[PDB]
Amino acid sequence: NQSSLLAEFGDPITRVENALQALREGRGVLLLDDEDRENEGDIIYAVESLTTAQMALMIRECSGIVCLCLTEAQADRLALPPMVVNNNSANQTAFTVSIEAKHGVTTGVSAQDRVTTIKTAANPQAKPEDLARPGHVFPLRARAGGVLARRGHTEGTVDLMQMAGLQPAGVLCELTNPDGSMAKTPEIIEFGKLHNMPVLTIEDMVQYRIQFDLKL
Amino acid sequence: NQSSLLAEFGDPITRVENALQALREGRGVLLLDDEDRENEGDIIYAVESLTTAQMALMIRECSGIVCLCLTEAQADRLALPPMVVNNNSANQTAFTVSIEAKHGVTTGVSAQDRVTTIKTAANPQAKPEDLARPGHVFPLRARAGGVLARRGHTEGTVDLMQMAGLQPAGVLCELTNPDGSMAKTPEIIEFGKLHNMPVLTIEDMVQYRIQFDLKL
Numbered sequence A, B: 001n002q003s004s005l006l007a008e009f010g011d012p013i014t015r016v017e018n019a020l021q022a023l024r025e026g027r028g029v030l031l032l033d034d035e036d037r038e039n040e041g042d043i044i045y046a047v048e049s050l051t052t053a054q055m056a057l058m059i060r061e062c063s064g065i066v067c068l069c070l071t072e073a074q075a076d077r078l079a080l081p082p083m084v085v086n087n088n089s090a091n092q093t094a095f096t097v098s099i100e101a102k103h104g105v106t107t108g109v110s111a112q113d114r115v116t117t118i119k120t121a122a123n124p125q126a127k128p129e130d131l132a133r134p135g136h137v138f139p140l141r142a143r144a145g146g147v148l149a150r151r152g153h154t155e156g157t158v159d160l161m162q163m164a165g166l167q168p169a170g171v172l173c174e175l176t177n178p179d180g181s182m183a184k185t186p187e188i189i190e191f192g193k194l195h196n197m198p199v200l201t202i203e204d205m206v207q208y209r210i211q212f213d214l215k216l
């Protein structure tokens, strides 16, 4: 089972604390949502410490559709409305229009270029004109309340940054097996051991936020 | 130089003919745009013969942002308007809203799921309701006239299918080096030898279409 498989990463509180410390150290984490939801594990990195090598790993090992999780306030500052008015995706994934840094990039898709765009968008002083649309980074609007309002990786990403005392922006991408199928828990666990990345779940975060009374 | 490097794939007419034959055989090709444009090589596959293994290779080896090149007529049939009204991307890349098959998929990102979405969208009998929006496949509207009107990989993709007598839909994705930088011509050539994929350029296609008087 999953509870049993994740036991070696510690108990739920420990899994959360280890993930937060990894982010504070500039390392990535692996976040699983509910088994009855997507049942997928995303690599998560903080934007603050994001490097080209970390983006290259996401591209190499994940779906390649690398998303930028923002607060509603930051997406509003950037003038990024939802990509679609009537979202009928299964989870109502909150894609805004896609973005490219207006300056400092070329075609936008290289690992370096994606980082430039992400840092440009996540800048607390950013303005809409700093970003061209469309582009090759995919922002996502986290719901107010985080994982206590919506049990998505989007909310998990922003909550992890806030809980770790980091600027409230992170990137995510779904871990993919070489044959193109999506990684499930055993493969996620093995990837996290290989890359020294903590694994935790949305359920871990929810019970952690409830018990420590963690508004954000 | 590039002319010299591609000489081993044949002369320009031969490079085009070999690419067309590969597509007819269900194989992929590598298309380079102008050195002074993106200077990137895209893997191209025909939708008609697209397999999970081909999609997995694109995800593994390319940017992961896999695009579906459609005619204007097919995008209109699907009710896919441009993603952004005032496109200010550098090349005015003609992204529509992103799409997911409404049925037959789960999270949409697995290689199989992307193929299901692509085949669903490319179906000559498709209807808008067959696709959820947003999603994890990125359609692109090819300009009328193809590479004789716009020298993009988008037009190259649809033109190649039409020139090969295939249904006029193809997928593309930018070849990426493991370190996250974008592949340039020497790496593209080496990838095409490794994977038995012909390499050709947009310039090859333009002069080919002009000289053989090829409306499409």
Ligand SMILES: O=C(CO)[C@H](O)[C@H](O)COP(=O)(O)O
Binding pocket: A033, A038, A042, A065, A067, A091, A092, A093, A140, A151, A152, A153, A154, A155, A172, A174, B107
């Ligand atoms: O679609 C996705 C990104 O492209 C993934 O599902 C991502 O994990 C965000 O979605 P959510 O917040 O719904 O879990």
Ligand SMILES: O=C(CO)[C@H](O)[C@H](O)COP(=O)(O)O
Binding pocket: A107, B033, B038, B042, B065, B067, B091, B092, B093, B140, B151, B152, B153, B154, B155, B172, B174
């Ligand atoms: O952005 C892209 C896809 O995401 C690439 O540039 C793609 O090759 C299509 O663009 P174009 O037709 O302008 O060459």
